[PDB]
């Protein structure tokens, strides 16, 4: 899997001019160092193995911090369960790495890291906690409380994680409706028409194919409420596998503003350096 | 028999240029029909050939000295272009490749350079703080196209927020630097070198066929990399003409006509 070896090149006095080209043609001049300067024979023992797409994407990346609480009812309101719509677009790094390409098709491997802590200095005593992470696909019922009937998870996939164990980990296949995931969608979901009763029938967001694209995850504690408040956070780590990508794009140069390609705040991404200053 | 002299013929139309650079086929793929192992809909597709696959000429844009750039979206630029626009509006699904020909002639005493970039899924940034609020009427300008702007003028009207784009020219309207846009399929119209550019675009999408009215697959952006200069005057302006021919056009699901509210 090694790189091509450098060929020996002597002096040249010829009608062939590999140095001159025209970038107006859209092609890049495929020169080797033997075509401009004299070169010795070098055998290359270097490889592009870690520059592959799989090696570029085989890292874990945090995409959500889901906060759940476990306390008995009081005058102050409580957050007994939490729900997160599945998207990668709210953290900048994995979104920037995925937005090098227009279309992608990968298998997917989630990992859940759960940490809990107290908030009251008076007692500090609580038992071990068991966390339920239920996948809710689009259109399926969503929980209205931490103890209602949707948590019975008859058809929905569910992970029961006990605290202190090794982090929970599952694989998801390619679930997308198209033959590739579309990172960028230059279009609308609905077209406003001349026969519409008002403009709000056909109005839709630009660059948004579907709302609730991949479903939501629900996190709760299955235990009864301890007398003191225990605040837990579930960190979700994305790792693409078997990754195939198409149509390379330039990376993002300005700070992200929402799920679209909108820019607002900085727009000044290059510094000052003089023309004749090294 | 040099590559500077080129003849393109499609249907009843023919383009001859004597100072081309070359022809770029985007990603090495010529346009093709759907083969049987990729066909998702079951209805027999309409392939009009000659009635749709012909060169259509848009409005000429005037390249003044202080101009910043122009952009178009396909197939939206051909929404009024005869039987292709009619077949686009009478059908639910459509697939076509394109041949984009940009014409910009100037004398040997003129100088300047244009970058003709072909961007798949050319999303453009909004004009205001409300994210992704750009309307369908402003996002689809048709054959008129749009223009780039030299700065983000933040639109802040209390009522009627205009729902437009604000494509910043060095940011290509999408937050990526203009110098890195050469990974898109591209040709440069350098006035000392060539007067025309040809890019052949295959159908690029995550689906085998898609709605052409809802979705624009390709975007064409023309930006002056070097500004236009002439001998000691400021009023110089030369015309730029963009010509697009659909290729391997096919349309699957027939229904009554679409009348969008522009």
């Amino acid at each position, epitope marked *: 899997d090694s790189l091509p070896d450098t060929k020996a090149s002597g002096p040249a006095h010829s009608k062939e001019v590999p140095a001159l080209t025209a970038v107006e043609t859209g092609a890049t001049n495929p020169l080797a160092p033997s075509d401009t300067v004299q070169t010795r024979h070098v055998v290359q023992r270097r490889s592009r193995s870690e520059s592959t797409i799989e090696s570029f994407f085989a890292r874990g990346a945090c995409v959500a911090i889901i906060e759940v609480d476990n306390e008995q009812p009081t005058t102050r309101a409580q957050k007994l369960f939490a729900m997160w719509r599945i998207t990668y677009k709210d*953290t900048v790094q994995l979104r920037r790495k995925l937005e090098f390409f227009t279309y992608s098709r990968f298998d997917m491997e989630f990992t859940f890291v759960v940490t809990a802590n107290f908030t009251n200095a008076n007692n500090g005593h609580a038992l071990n906690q068991v966390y339920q992470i239920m996948y809710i696909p689009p259109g399926a019922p969503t929980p209205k409380s931490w103890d209602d009937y949707t948590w019975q998870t008859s058809s929905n996939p569910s992970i029961f994680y006990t605290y202190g164990a090794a982090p929970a980990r599952i694989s998801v296949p390619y679930v997308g409706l198209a033959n590739a995931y579309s990172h960028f969608y230059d279009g609308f979901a609905k077209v406003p028409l001349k026969t519409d009763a008002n403009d709000q029938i056909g109005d839709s967001l630009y660059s948004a194919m579907t709302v609730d694209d991949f479903g939501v995850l629900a996190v709760r504690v299955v235990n009864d409420h301890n007398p003191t408040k225990v605040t837990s956070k579930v960190r979700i780590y994305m790792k693409p596998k078997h990754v195939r990508v198409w149509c390379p794009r330039p990376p993002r140069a300005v700070p992200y503003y929402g799920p679209g390609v909108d820019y607002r705040n900085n727009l000044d991404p290059l510094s000052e350096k003089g023309l004749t200053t090294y | 028999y040099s590559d500077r002299v080129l003849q393109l013929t499609l249907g009843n139309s023919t383009i001859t240029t004597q100072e081309a650079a070359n022809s770029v086929v985007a990603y090495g793929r010529w346009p093709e029909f759907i083969r049987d192992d990729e066909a998702n809909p079951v209805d027999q597709p309409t392939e009009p050939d000659v009635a749709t696959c012909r060169f259509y000429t848009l409005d000429t844009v005037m390249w003044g000295k202080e101009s910043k750039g122009w952009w178009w979206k396909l197939p939206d630029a051909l929404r009024d272009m005869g039987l292709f626009g009619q077949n686009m509006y009478y059908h639910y699904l459509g697939r076509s490749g394109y041949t984009v020909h940009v014409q910009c002639n100037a004398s040997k005493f003129h100088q300047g350079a244009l970058g003709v970039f072909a961007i798949p899924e050319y999303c453009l940034a909004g004009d205001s703080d409300k994210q992704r609020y750009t309307s369908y009427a402003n996002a689809n300008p048709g054959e008129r196209g749009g223009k780039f702007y030299s700065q983000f003028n933040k639109d802040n009207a209390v009522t009627s927020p205009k729902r437009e784009f604000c494509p910043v020219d060095y940011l290509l309207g999408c937050g990526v630097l203009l110098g890195n846009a050469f990974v898109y399929p591209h040709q440069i119209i350098n006035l000392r070198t060539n007067n025309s550019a040809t890019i052949v675009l295959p159908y690029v999408n995550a689906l085998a066929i898609d709605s052409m009215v809802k979705h624009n697959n390709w975007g064409i952006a023309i930006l002056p990399l070097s500004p236009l200069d002439f001998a000691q005057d400021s009023s110089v302006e030369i015309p730029i003409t963009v010509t697009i021919a659909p290729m391997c056009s096919e349309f699957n699901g027939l229904r009554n006509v679409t009348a969008p509210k522009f």
Partner: antibody
Amino acid sequence: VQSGALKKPGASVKFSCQASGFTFTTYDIHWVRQAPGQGLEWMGMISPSRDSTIYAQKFQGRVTMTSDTSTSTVYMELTSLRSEDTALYYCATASRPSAWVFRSLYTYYYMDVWGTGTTVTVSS
Amino acid sequence: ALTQPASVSGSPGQSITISCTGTITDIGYYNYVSWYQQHPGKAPKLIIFDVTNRPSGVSDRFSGSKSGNTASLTISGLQAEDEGDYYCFSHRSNNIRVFGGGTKLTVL
């Protein structure tokens, strides 16, 4: 919540909203006004945990908001007032947490704790 | 401000739906749709916090739903103590918040 409990035309009017210390440091503080029969109207947000302030687009120039950690009080100054500003002005604490994760890193909060407010008349 | 009907009326024992229609973003994108109750002279009281969810102490005759750009509040089994104003609340994009126009409910 103590809302401070005013009339003059044109000149600037200052407001006060004092809360308990845990709710002051932990939760955001919002301002809502209500003209008689004209419905509710949002004014802005003070977050004393990080001193970040967001103002409504109708009120982005006229309204300035400060925080005070010593007496656990927030203050709002309307720098110039007009005759339409004759209204009942409320202070609200964002205490009710939502199930839905805001972006992917935060928790959204509605208000269910409201002050009794104060009435300001802008006329001679 | 979000559109609401100005006044709805009904006799006791009836079922009454009050509708709050916003726009794209707003009710249609976010699930941060809320409802408030205001009797004359009183502070506003939260009656529905998330779209279909009720706070503690709110009676079960209140209910809510979302159908798109429109969120509806349904009161089933109307009582005379339900007379007053109802205000819709939702989250708009770029982190601003906007109330509804308000609906006066009169128990006939």
